[PDB]
């Protein structure tokens with residue numbers, strides 16, 4: 001009955017969007033650099049050169065993003081199992097079945113994607129040779145991390161604002 | 173088991189209860205809902221009148237060992253007729269004089 | 274009303290009593306663990322159910338009334 | 354500890370008392386309970402000492 | 408009042424009333440229904456425990 | 457009894473108790489998108505199906 | 521004809537089969553009640569790629585039988601006599617019947 | 627000694643359990659507290675069942691006669707067939723769909739009369 005229904009919430013528990021100074025404070029030097037690089041690459045790729053952007057995107061798709069999408073799709077198919085859920089030789093209730101499927105499948109996809117991220121994101125950050133090498137190369141600082149955090153929040157705000165008028169928007 | 177023999181056995185068992193339409197309720201007392209329904213639906217008056225029978229916990233071996241009554245103790249207390257009077261399985265204490273000095 | 278309910282056909286004497294349950298004497302030929310397992314299985318198979326039955330019988334006999342014939346034989350009741 | 358335990362076991366066996374520990378006879382060689390008690394009293398404390406020191 | 412009957416009645420009157428009550432209770436128990444109730448109560452002692 | 461235990465393990469892993477769908481899901485979960493044989497070779501699944509952050513048109517067509 | 525009648529009666533009243541089964545099993549034996557439950561023969565994902573849990577559950581139930589009309593029901597001895605008489609008649613009709621063993625089992 | 631102490635503990639525990647499980651049958655406890663507790667439990671159970679029944683009755687009285695049959699079907703199912711395996715919900719769904727067929731026929735008649 002509040003923002004958690006109509007606002008955007010799929011970007012807050014994924015892609016290291018939750019990384020802040022608390023993790024960096026306890027992290028060692030190398031761990032801090034790796035975390036900062038991961039956050040910057042996921043949220044504000046603009047700070048990276050095109051080659052690094054492409055390489056990091058390929059690694060992310062291979063490890064976390066596409067894997068979570070596939071797992072969510074498998075869970076959604078599991079939900080689809082048994083369709084139509086309620087029907088008989090007289091009526092099939094197509095609208096009710098469509099509503100039930102649309103309500104159930106995306107929830108299972110979300111559960112699967114969240115599971116995949118929770119399981120693999122820490123391992124990907126900790127034990128990825130590509131991420132380690134790129135973090136060593138770039139050597140980001142706490143100031144860079146703070147700038148990236150502000151820029152990521154502003155990007156989320158811009159994305160929310162742009163989709164304000166999805167039906168009618170003359171402009172002037 | 174032969175199909176015909178099983179069918180005959182089932183029919184005989186069903187008709188043994190009564191040669192008329194009957195109503196059967198199945199309850200699993202281990203479950204809360206089933207137990208509450210079973211206790212609500214079972215009435216002692218019907219069981220006594222034989223309009224209802226419960227099957228599943230027969231436990232027909234209810235014949236006790238005929239607990240012996242303490243005849244010796246009862247006779248010992250009867251012999252004390254100056255203190256206790258026995259009537260209708262009731263022990264009445266004869267009133268005593270608290271002022272005995 | 275049930276609080277003040279009373280049953281006058283029950284025996285009026287105390288029903289407390291002693292029951293004998295024979296034991297399994299320790300067997301030195303087995304050993305500590307074998308004897309312990311024997312004792313455990315005996316407790317689970319004979320001693321425990323026997324005591325449970327004794328306690329249930331004690332609980333139920335305190336409610337089971339005495340028959341009229343038994344009352345007459347004991348002299349507790351005189352007919353008419 | 355081993356000497357005290359052996360002395361106690363010997364004296365109580367001489368008087369006819371044997372602690373009811375271990376089987377009376379062995380499963381394979383039929384070694385007596387007294388012999389196995391002596392063996393255990395000799396070996397177990399050494400193993401415990403080694404483990405504690407390690 | 409029923410619980411503390413004895414406090415208000417004399418020995419003889421209490422004995423008379425209690426004897427009448429006990430005789431009537433004995434007759435009621437000897438009535439067939441009470442015997443069936445007691446038999447049913449004793450029937451399932453093992454399961455109820 | 458070792459052969460009996462092996463037979464019991466095979467039976468417990470049998471299809472009727474441990475679904476092949478569960479096995480496939482476990483394989484996908486344990487393997488990455490470049491090692492998974494079912495999708496590493498296929499560019500369409502790895503890019504067009506699962507590679508797009510928003511594939512509403514294809515999802516709607518598949519659902520229909 | 522039997523199958524069509526069963527289908528029509530079940531559709532008219534879903535409790536028809538349940539009532540008949542309860543009536544049959546009321547006085548049935550413990551080994552009769554021990555029988556398993558029906559298995560789903562339908563195919564699809566749950567049969568090919570998934571696993572469908574069986575319908576079997578605990579079978580410790582108490583059958584409370586009450587006469588709709590209200591007539592007195594037969595006691596245990598009367599029921600035993602009725603079953604024995606029916607078994608004797610069936611054996612006379614067919615010597616090879618094992619109704620005696622079935623009854624003696626429980 | 628140790629065995630006797632263990633058996634004494636076991637006997638006390640068994641007596642306590644037997645009391646706690648079957649004290650409502652006898653009048654050993656003055657005022658029959660366990661008996662009154664059991665009677666109260668049975669009264670609460672019966673009152674809950676009769677409360678469900680009376681709620682069903684009042685809803686039935688207030689329900690329109692057009693869907694009174696559907697309410698009857700749903701009530702009977704929720705009471706009996708929910709916990710029964712032999713009762714196939716497909717037949718109940720078929721009855722509901724027949725009622726819905728009648729309702730749709732009436733609706734279309736009203737729309738296109």
Ligand SMILES: CCCCCCCCCCCCCCCCCC(=O)OC[C@H](COP(=O)([O-])OCC(O)COP(=O)([O-])OC[C@@H](COC(=O)CCCCCCCCCCCCCCCCC)OC(=O)CCCCCCCCCCCCCCCCC)OC(=O)CCCCCCCCCCCCCCCCC
Pocket residue numbers: 092093094095096100103
């Ligand atoms: C314990 C477990 C349970 C509880 C927990 C559950 C948790 C999970 C929940 C989610 C998942 C499970 C869901 C289960 C329930 C599913 C639903 C259900 O119950 O189904 C049975 C049942 C469905 O009915 P049924 O008896 O089974 O019948 C089946 C149908 O026949 C089947 O349909 P059909 O096949 O008959 O087809 C019908 C079709 C007919 O098919 C056709 O032939 C189509 C005919 C129409 C064609 C044309 C279509 C386009 C028309 C356009 C018209 C103009 C539009 C204008 C729009 C303007 C917009 C501004 O009709 C249409 O679709 C056409 C109508 C379109 C809709 C209405 C349009 C409104 C327009 C605007 C109106 C106002 C304008 C005002 C203007 C100014 C004044 C004039 O449910 C109900 O009856 C009610 C259910 C209510 C559910 C409420 C749920 C609330 C949320 C709960 C969850 C969240 C909160 C937490 C709760 C926790 C517990 C307390």
Ligand SMILES: CCCCCCCCCCCCCCCCCC(=O)OC[C@H](COP(=O)([O-])OCC(O)COP(=O)([O-])OC[C@@H](COC(=O)CCCCCCCCCCCCCCCCC)OC(=O)CCCCCCCCCCCCCCCCC)OC(=O)CCCCCCCCCCCCCCCCC
Pocket residue numbers: 304305306307374375376380
């Ligand atoms: C502070 C720490 C945090 C936790 C809180 C604190 C917890 C404190 C717990 C204290 C527990 C005290 C228990 C006292 C028992 C006193 C028994 C007695 O009366 O003594 C006389 C008794 C005299 O024996 P007997 O009855 O005359 O029989 C001799 C006959 O000649 C021979 O008669 P037979 O041949 O006719 O038939 C018997 C024969 C028949 O053959 C058998 O049945 C032998 C079976 C051998 C084991 C088979 C499985 C192998 C796989 C490994 C174990 C996995 C667990 C599954 C075990 C399944 C059941 C065995 O078996 C025997 O010989 C019986 C004795 C077997 C002793 C050898 C095994 C010892 C270790 C057992 C496992 C302990 C847990 C390990 C967990 C994992 C650690 C990484 O003394 C003995 O001979 C045995 C004394 C054992 C004392 C154990 C003290 C343990 C203290 C440390 C506890 C913690 C351990 C590490 C885990 C830590 C977790 C945090």
Ligand SMILES: CCCCCCCCCCCCCCCCCC(=O)OC[C@H](COP(=O)([O-])OCC(O)COP(=O)([O-])OC[C@@H](COC(=O)CCCCCCCCCCCCCCCCC)OC(=O)CCCCCCCCCCCCCCCCC)OC(=O)CCCCCCCCCCCCCCCCC
Pocket residue numbers: 375376378379380381382383384385389392393396400
């Ligand atoms: C590192 C070495 C340290 C050595 C220290 C010195 C002491 C031990 C060695 C002494 C050797 C010479 C002794 C004098 C011999 C005189 C002649 C004679 O008649 O013998 C006296 C007497 C036997 O005569 P008996 O009249 O036939 O008495 C039979 C009674 O049942 C016996 O009744 P009981 O009164 O003796 O009581 C049963 C026995 C308890 O005996 C049991 O039955 C307990 C069994 C526990 C099994 C736990 C799970 C094992 C899982 C597999 C492990 C694989 C190896 C891992 C190695 C890791 C790296 C070290 O003792 C107790 O329950 C009380 C003590 C509490 C347990 C403490 C045990 C500590 C043992 C430490 C040494 C282990 C060496 C392992 C060598 C490799 C084995 C593969 O010998 C002993 O008392 C010594 C027993 C030594 C342990 C035997 C274990 C047998 C079961 C092995 C199972 C796994 C392999 C199965 C292979 C199957 C075929 C392929």
Ligand SMILES: CCCCCCCCCCCCCCCCCC(=O)OC[C@H](COP(=O)([O-])OCC(O)COP(=O)([O-])OC[C@@H](COC(=O)CCCCCCCCCCCCCCCCC)OC(=O)CCCCCCCCCCCCCCCCC)OC(=O)CCCCCCCCCCCCCCCCC
Pocket residue numbers: 075078079108111115475477478481482485566569570571572573574
């Ligand atoms: C915990 C261990 C995790 C290990 C992970 C390891 C990685 C591999 C995982 C493998 C399993 C998943 C992939 C294969 C699935 C195959 C399914 C299949 O074909 O079976 C046919 C199977 C046939 O059913 P059935 O066996 O006949 O049973 C009939 C029951 O009605 C059907 O239900 P049921 O009683 O059989 O139990 C399933 C039941 C739930 O059961 C559980 O909880 C499952 C518990 C965990 C089971 C784990 C099994 C796999 C273990 C693998 C690892 C083994 C390791 C061994 C090695 C050693 C380890 C030390 O699921 C549902 O039906 C849930 C639907 C409702 C949504 C609930 C969630 C959202 C909350 C909604 C609340 C609404 C309240 C009202 C409104 C409130 C408003 C405020 O179909 C289904 O059960 C369909 C389920 C559809 C929904 C599934 C997705 C929703 C969430 C499910 C529960 C949460 C777990 C999600 C997965 C977590 C993964 C980490």
Ligand SMILES: CCCCCCCCCCCCCCCCCC(=O)OC[C@H](COP(=O)(O)OCCN)OC(=O)CCCCCCCCCCCCCCCCC
Pocket residue numbers: 001002005006099100103160163164165166
């Ligand atoms: C007190 C509890 C409830 C509290 C919340 C109440 C919310 C009321 C508003 C409608 C809610 C519909 C169900 C929940 C949807 C949750 C997601 C959501 O609302 O997404 C946003 C979107 C509308 O947002 P919009 O303003 O158009 O987009 C601006 C973007 N910057 O959402 C939509 O466009 C979705 C709704 C479209 C209109 C549908 C009208 C008919 C109802 C259909 C419901 C879905 C089908 C369900 C069928 C099975 C269950 C019955």
Ligand SMILES: CCCCCCCCCCCCCCCCCC(=O)OC[C@H](COP(=O)(O)OCCN)OC(=O)CCCCCCCCCCCCCCCCC
Pocket residue numbers: 164165166167168169
């Ligand atoms: C939809 C209901 C139709 C009911 C028809 C019958 C009644 C007629 C009487 C007048 C009714 C006027 C109703 C106006 C509702 C406006 C709703 C609205 O504002 O919705 C949002 C929409 C665009 O917003 P969106 O891009 O989706 O996202 C949110 C933006 N922050 O906002 C806009 O589009 C901007 C505001 C537009 C207001 C227009 C009002 C006059 C419309 C006249 C249309 C006449 C022809 C319609 C067809 C024939 C009707 C008989």
Ligand SMILES: CCCCCCCCCCCCCCCC(=O)OC[C@H](COP(=O)(O)O)OC(=O)CCCCCCCCCCCCCCC
Pocket residue numbers: 010069072073076077080101102105106109113505506508509510511512514515516517518519
């Ligand atoms: C013509 C057929 C072509 C395709 C054939 C093979 C398809 C097999 C896989 C199914 C599709 C999976 C798509 C996954 C990527 C994706 O969706 O990508 C688009 C987004 C990605 O989500 P994120 O942005 O959070 O990563 O998906 C979602 O938002 C969730 C939608 C559901 C996805 C899983 C499928 C559920 C079942 C679909 C039917 C139910 C209704 C769906 C809405 C109308």
Ligand code: HEM
Pocket residue numbers: 493494495497498499500501
């Ligand atoms: C194990 C399962 C599958 C394997 C191994 C597989 C493998 C492949 C491979 C190797 C290609 C060639 C990619 C390329 O051109 O480089 C391909 C293309 C394609 N596959 Fe699959 N595939 C599988 C399942 C599916 C399914 C289920 C669909 C559709 C429902 C599908 C649709 C396609 C399409 C449309 C193309 C063409 C893409 C293009 O031309 O760009 N495949 N597949």
